[PDB]
Design a protein around this motif. Structure first.
Motif, mmCIF file in Angstrom:
data_model
loop_
_atom_site.group_PDB
_atom_site.id
_atom_site.type_symbol
_atom_site.label_atom_id
_atom_site.label_comp_id
_atom_site.label_asym_id
_atom_site.label_seq_id
_atom_site.Cartn_x
_atom_site.Cartn_y
_atom_site.Cartn_z
ATOM 1 N N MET A 105 -26.926 -10.641 1.528
ATOM 2 C CA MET A 105 -27.377 -11.445 0.400
ATOM 3 C C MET A 105 -26.758 -12.836 0.441
ATOM 4 O O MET A 105 -27.440 -13.836 0.207
ATOM 5 C CB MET A 105 -27.045 -10.748 -0.917
ATOM 6 N N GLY A 106 -25.468 -12.897 0.756
ATOM 7 C CA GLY A 106 -24.774 -14.168 0.860
ATOM 8 C C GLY A 106 -25.325 -15.040 1.974
ATOM 9 O O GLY A 106 -25.596 -16.226 1.776
ATOM 10 N N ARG A 107 -25.487 -14.460 3.159
ATOM 11 C CA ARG A 107 -26.033 -15.210 4.282
ATOM 12 C C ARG A 107 -27.447 -15.691 3.962
ATOM 13 O O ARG A 107 -27.802 -16.836 4.238
ATOM 14 C CB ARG A 107 -26.029 -14.370 5.561
ATOM 15 N N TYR A 108 -28.243 -14.811 3.367
ATOM 16 C CA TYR A 108 -29.608 -15.143 2.975
ATOM 17 C C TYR A 108 -29.648 -16.324 2.006
ATOM 18 O O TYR A 108 -30.419 -17.264 2.189
ATOM 19 C CB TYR A 108 -30.285 -13.924 2.347
ATOM 20 N N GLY A 109 -28.816 -16.272 0.972
ATOM 21 C CA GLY A 109 -28.758 -17.348 0.001
ATOM 22 C C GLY A 109 -28.210 -18.633 0.588
ATOM 23 O O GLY A 109 -28.716 -19.720 0.308
ATOM 24 N N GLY A 110 -27.167 -18.513 1.403
ATOM 25 C CA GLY A 110 -26.541 -19.675 2.012
ATOM 26 C C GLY A 110 -27.509 -20.501 2.842
ATOM 27 O O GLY A 110 -27.404 -21.728 2.903
ATOM 28 N N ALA A 111 -28.458 -19.823 3.480
ATOM 29 C CA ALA A 111 -29.449 -20.490 4.320
ATOM 30 C C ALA A 111 -30.344 -21.404 3.490
ATOM 31 O O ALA A 111 -30.980 -22.318 4.015
ATOM 32 C CB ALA A 111 -30.282 -19.463 5.067
ATOM 33 N N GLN A 112 -30.390 -21.155 2.186
ATOM 34 C CA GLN A 112 -31.179 -21.982 1.285
ATOM 35 C C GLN A 112 -30.287 -22.832 0.381
ATOM 36 O O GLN A 112 -30.750 -23.392 -0.608
ATOM 37 C CB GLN A 112 -32.119 -21.113 0.448
ATOM 38 N N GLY A 113 -29.007 -22.925 0.724
ATOM 39 C CA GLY A 113 -28.081 -23.754 -0.026
ATOM 40 C C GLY A 113 -27.527 -23.124 -1.294
ATOM 41 O O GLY A 113 -27.087 -23.832 -2.199
ATOM 42 N N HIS A 114 -27.537 -21.798 -1.363
ATOM 43 C CA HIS A 114 -27.025 -21.100 -2.542
ATOM 44 C C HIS A 114 -26.015 -20.022 -2.164
ATOM 45 O O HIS A 114 -26.217 -19.278 -1.208
ATOM 46 C CB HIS A 114 -28.175 -20.497 -3.355
ATOM 47 N N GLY A 115 -24.923 -19.941 -2.917
ATOM 48 C CA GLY A 115 -23.860 -19.009 -2.598
ATOM 49 C C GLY A 115 -23.498 -18.058 -3.722
ATOM 50 O O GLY A 115 -22.694 -17.147 -3.530
ATOM 51 N N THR A 116 -24.088 -18.261 -4.896
ATOM 52 C CA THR A 116 -23.774 -17.416 -6.048
ATOM 53 C C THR A 116 -25.004 -16.691 -6.588
ATOM 54 O O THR A 116 -26.139 -17.103 -6.341
ATOM 55 C CB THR A 116 -23.084 -18.213 -7.174
ATOM 56 N N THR A 117 -24.764 -15.616 -7.333
ATOM 57 C CA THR A 117 -25.822 -14.677 -7.710
ATOM 58 C C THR A 117 -26.898 -15.146 -8.703
ATOM 59 O O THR A 117 -27.996 -14.607 -8.696
ATOM 60 C CB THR A 117 -25.243 -13.323 -8.179
ATOM 61 N N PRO A 118 -26.592 -16.124 -9.574
ATOM 62 C CA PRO A 118 -27.697 -16.552 -10.441
ATOM 63 C C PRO A 118 -28.873 -17.077 -9.619
ATOM 64 O O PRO A 118 -30.024 -16.726 -9.891
ATOM 65 C CB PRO A 118 -27.078 -17.679 -11.273
ATOM 66 N N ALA A 119 -28.579 -17.907 -8.625
ATOM 67 C CA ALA A 119 -29.606 -18.429 -7.733
ATOM 68 C C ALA A 119 -30.103 -17.362 -6.761
ATOM 69 O O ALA A 119 -31.309 -17.195 -6.576
ATOM 70 C CB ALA A 119 -29.082 -19.638 -6.968
ATOM 71 N N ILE A 120 -29.171 -16.641 -6.141
ATOM 72 C CA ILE A 120 -29.527 -15.671 -5.110
ATOM 73 C C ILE A 120 -30.381 -14.525 -5.650
ATOM 74 O O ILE A 120 -31.330 -14.091 -4.998
ATOM 75 C CB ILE A 120 -28.280 -15.118 -4.383
ATOM 76 N N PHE A 121 -30.049 -14.043 -6.843
ATOM 77 C CA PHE A 121 -30.849 -13.009 -7.489
ATOM 78 C C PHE A 121 -32.268 -13.518 -7.738
ATOM 79 O O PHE A 121 -33.238 -12.765 -7.646
ATOM 80 C CB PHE A 121 -30.213 -12.590 -8.812
#
Ligand code: BOG
Ligand code: BOG
Ligand code: BOG
Ligand code: BOG
Ligand code: BOG
Ligand code: BOG
Ligand code: BOG
Ligand code: BOG
Ligand code: BOG
Ligand code: BOG
Ligand code: MET
Ligand code: MET
Ligand code: NA
Ligand code: NA
Ligand code: NA
Ligand code: NA
Lengths: 509, 509
Positions: free
Chosen positions: A61-77
């Motif tokens: 989930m972290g790697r997935y979000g990071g690829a789009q410039g996001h590292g925390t769950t509000p955005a990643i969720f």
């Protein structure tokens, strides 16, 4: 976006995320309270059915979000589930680590304060056989440090030294975080982890030499590694084991997700994740398990050691162990080594728990790293005054965020990733770039077993344990509840502001 | 930017800003505690040397800021003084009204709850001569409503009715605010103020008919309007008088500034400001002064009335007056009219104290009015739980924000406007567009007299009154202190975010 510089650095940082006060303070108490060897079967099983699968899920989930410039769950969720409710559920991934930081850094500061005092020999001195004439001076030492209540008022009165040491501790955390991922956390991990391992090994060796009329350290190991299948039926032990697994692996804290958001999109997370998890377990069961318990059993025997363990959460680590050491030549310096070990263990974990707030401020509110780190430190520092001055506030925060919260959030993140986002898409995302592939069986564990395991656990927990706590507590628990609920509202407002900034930004581009 | 639609609407809104619970609840108690007529000389003098000049200054600052799209003090202070410290000092102009809103709206909700219960006749019934057999049922009525502690715990237990009524009260405030300046606050003011005046006049007339073996309402008026020059030397009376002037005129609350920010750049503020101030004083000394005190003196005599006044801040208004009314035909309905009057008085003031937070969110964070009003309501609603459940939390907030804070902020705003910004520039800004000019003498009052008056007042206050409070309070005061300090930090963070949004915005334009 920042990225981890080397694979080794990534691994040691993640290992440092995990290997903390939980290994050396929490694990021994949990294992001792639950029959020792009787705790270990459920513990190993939870590691396999919960610890490992959830670790992979959070890295992914972290790697997935990071690829789009996001590292925390509000955005990643929200990336995983395009629904307003995803953002709100995601707030727990900021709230949990913030609340945990608020008490964890304080406890970490005690280990620094004790290390300093033990180094300079400003420590108590028992009367050279009574198990109470020796322990009392060390109990009073801790009580004077944190300021345990002498009367009826639920108020703590920390020494000036403890307060200044907390300030220093915050400064040290900031000094690392302010330098960022590769130059800050990663570089420190490469220094701290090897130091941590060496100190721990030395301490294990020293403890293994303990022998008294009451027993040997070997007796402690036997108590810990002797199964009691008649306990496999006790639900309480399972709850304890799963809780320790979460706490120990930093799962449900949002911390693994945020670190993993700095892993390059294509970089392996299967072997790396597994390696970090395994390193933690070694440090916990081999190192942490072999220090406090064997020392206590050697000097007091099993029955007394267990009683000490049930006595409190800090009795064993801050009172009993140093008291035991004081009966040995060079024992004051051994005490220093113990608290120094705890401090490095704490420090590498606390930088991890504050990074989610930092990442959110950077990623979503577009703050500079400097401003993000300083505001994060300010909020943690201010809020910690509640834990410093209100008796049992620490316990309340550790319950809602560090116990219930992490398990609830773990189930949530799994449901969102493997159920809503898509089991096959999740499975593919985890394995993508893997140096090794996740064993096929773990697909069915993640999709069916883990969620069901946690769901049943939480329900049983809720039915037969929680009501006592809501009904049978002092009114002051509501002060801490009120405050941390306010913290959630505050973070929800920040997420709202982040949406508005994004909307206005897109309207311009 | 929104603007007031008509001059009359502006005046009635500003009058509604001022004329509040302070006129009908606070003034009678303050005057009674301080010798009645002995209070009035310092009171009149404070009105002339502080009330009037500060009113003009705040109208001017608001109009000045509004012309540049700013209605709150963090921005306005910075316009007047281009210094980082101006922004930080400006935070008090958001903090004070937020904290006051947190307890003021709750008290306002009680008046609604009482109005409802008195209307439907769900009220106590004394035993038809003992001054205690009649009062006790009304004391118990208030105590059950707000939930005064019966034991040792400093915890309040408000009735379910009181809680729901607070929710309704918040809803009513939001319903007006959500419609904005002209269609919301201004339109309501045109309805509420005339209603308020009529109710008050009726009540004065009714009270003026009271005569008992102990005296007449005329005796109450004589106690209030008979000077005692031997008190002109007592500093305490001056402090009380100045405090009431601030509270009563809404000065130092940031509320007048924010309302004035919707006055057109060229529109008169000299005559309008003076008119609003004068209307308030009439409602206070003629209406508020002629209801509670005369009623109490008529039934109990002066000595007993004064003792009642010292008894508490709410005893006279929520217990004594309704108890007195209950001894008269139609007295229950008269009670309804009294609480209905208080509610409209409260309501027109509470919409004023929440508008600064709303204006800041709109002006500086660019939130829509809808979002700004709702988030403001949410913060006030959540925070009010502290005042609802922790005994004496209300008192603590009213002290720091509503007493000390407003006087401190008044001195600050004057120093910034008349000293830093420039006396001549300030003088010119006040008079610009004036239908009348400010008397020349007031230039020297504003520049030299007012600041010196306040400075001496604060020093004397600080030397001989404050230390007792810091040293002689229950430990629970720190819960409220901690929370409102957190509120200041929160608002400081919002101001920081507003700067960053502005910087990024300018970089794009
Ligand atoms: C940033 C929020 C500050 C709130 C008030 C904190 C006041 C801390 O007060 C300090 O506490 C120490 C520990 O007990 C004492 O040793 C010091 O004498 C005392 O000044
Ligand atoms: C390691 C850097 C932090 C040092 C903080 C020291 C704060 C001073 O602490 C003081 O020490 C005195 C002498 O021991 C005591 O007698 C006082 O009670 C104590 O307030
Ligand atoms: C919710 C947390 C609020 C913390 C408020 C701390 C206020 C500090 O207050 C000070 O603390 C010292 C040490 O306890 C005392 O010696 C002083 O008497 C007291 O004024
Ligand atoms: C409770 C979950 C425990 C999982 C342990 C899995 C151990 C590895 O199991 C192996 O996985 C390989 C890859 O799928 C297969 O090729 C092997 O046949 C299988 O034995
Ligand atoms: C600071 C304001 C606190 C007010 C709320 C206190 C209300 C008292 O409620 C108490 O709550 C405890 C925890 O749920 C329970 O254990 C007690 O049985 C209950 O009496
Ligand atoms: C938004 C923050 C909510 C924090 C917990 C608030 C719980 C309110 O609790 C309510 O209080 C009322 C007044 O005593 C009672 O009449 C109700 O029975 C009770 O449910
Ligand atoms: C005016 C709209 C708000 C009305 C809220 C009413 C909440 C119900 O209040 C209930 O009323 C009962 C009958 O009087 C009492 O016996 C209960 O103790 C009380 O909880
Ligand atoms: C700082 C403010 C915190 C407020 C917390 C309110 C929590 C409400 O808690 C509830 O309150 C009811 C009414 O008091 C009680 O009857 C219940 O026993 C209690 O659980
Ligand atoms: C304490 C301050 C009280 C001020 C009262 C001022 C009353 C008006 O005073 C008048 O002001 C006019 C305009 O400057 C002058 O032309 C008059 O000569 C003067 O008497
Ligand atoms: C919720 C955490 C509260 C901890 C701080 C309480 C420290 C006790 O400090 C108390 O403060 C009061 C107010 O200044 C004083 O009146 C008392 O003399 C003092 O003992
Ligand atoms: C503060 S990060 C979460 C806890 C950490 N894994 C530990 O075991 O101490
Ligand atoms: C809540 S606005 C400030 C108080 C108001 N002027 C009153 O007298 O009640
Ligand atoms: Na761990
Ligand atoms: Na660590
Ligand atoms: Na007023
Ligand atoms: Na009003």
């Amino acid at each position: 976006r920042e990225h981890w510089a080397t694979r080794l650095g990534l691994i040691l940082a993640m290992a440092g995320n995990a290997v903390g006060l939980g290994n050396f303070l929490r694990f021994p108490v949990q294992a001792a309270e639950n029959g020792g060897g009787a705790f270990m079967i459920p513990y190993i099983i939870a590691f396999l059915l919960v610890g490992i699968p959830l670790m992979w899920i959070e890295w992914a989930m972290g790697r997935y979000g990071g690829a789009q410039g996001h590292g925390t769950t509000p955005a990643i969720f929200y990336l995983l589930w395009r629904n307003r409710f995803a953002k709100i559920l995601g707030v727990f991934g900021l709230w949990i680590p913030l609340v945990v930081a608020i008490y964890y850094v304080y406890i970490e500061s005690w280990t620094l304060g004790f290390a300093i005092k033990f180094l300079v020999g400003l420590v108590p001195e028992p009367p050279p056989t009574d198990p109470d004439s020796i322990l009392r001076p060390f109990k009073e030492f801790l009580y004077s440090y944190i300021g345990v209540p002498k009367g009826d008022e639920p108020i703590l009165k920390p020494s000036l030294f403890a307060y200044i040491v907390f300030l220093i501790t915050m400064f040290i955390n900031v000094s690392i975080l302010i330098r960022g991922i590769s130059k800050g956390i990663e570089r420190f991990a490469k220094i701290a982890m090897p130091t941590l391992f060496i100190l721990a090994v030395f301490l294990v060796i020293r403890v293994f030499l303990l022998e008294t009329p009451n027993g040997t350290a070997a007796d402690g190991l036997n108590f810990l590694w002797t199964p009691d299948f008649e306990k496999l039926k006790d639900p309480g032990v399972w709850i304890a084991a799963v809780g320790q697994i979460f706490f120990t692996l930093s799962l449900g804290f949002g911390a693994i997700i945020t670190y993993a958001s700095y892993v390059r999109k294509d970089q392996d997370i299967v072997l790396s994740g597994l390696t970090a998890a395994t390193l933690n377990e070694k440090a916990e069961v081999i190192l942490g398990g072999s220090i406090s318990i064997p020392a206590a059993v050697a000097f007091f025997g099993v029955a007394n050691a267990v009683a000490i363990a049930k006595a409190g959460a800090f009795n064993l680590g801050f009172i009993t162990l140093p008291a035991i050491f004081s009966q040995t030549a060079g024992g004051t310096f051994l005490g220093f080594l113990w608290f120094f070990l705890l401090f490095f263990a704490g420090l590498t974990s606390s930088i991890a728990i504050m990074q989610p707030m930092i990442a959110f401020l950077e990623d979503e509110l577009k703050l500079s790293r400097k401003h993000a780190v300083l505001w994060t430190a300010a909020i943690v520092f201010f809020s910690a005054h509640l834990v410093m001055f209100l008796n049992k506030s620490l316990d309340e925060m550790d319950f809602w965020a560090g116990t219930i919260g992490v398990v609830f959030f773990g189930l949530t993140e799994l449901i969102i990733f493997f159920w809503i986002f898509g089991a096959d898409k999740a499975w593919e995302e985890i394995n993508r770039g893997g140096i090794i592939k996740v064993p096929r069986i773990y697909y069915y564990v993640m999709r069916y077993i883990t969620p069901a395991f946690l769901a049943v656990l939480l329900v049983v927990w809720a039915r037969e344990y929680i009501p006592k706590i809501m009904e049978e507590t002092h009114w002051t628990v509501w002060i801490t509840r009120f405050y941390i609920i306010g913290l959630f509202l505050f973070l929800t407002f920040l997420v709202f502001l982040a949406e508005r900034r994004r909307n206005h930004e897109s309207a311009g581009t």
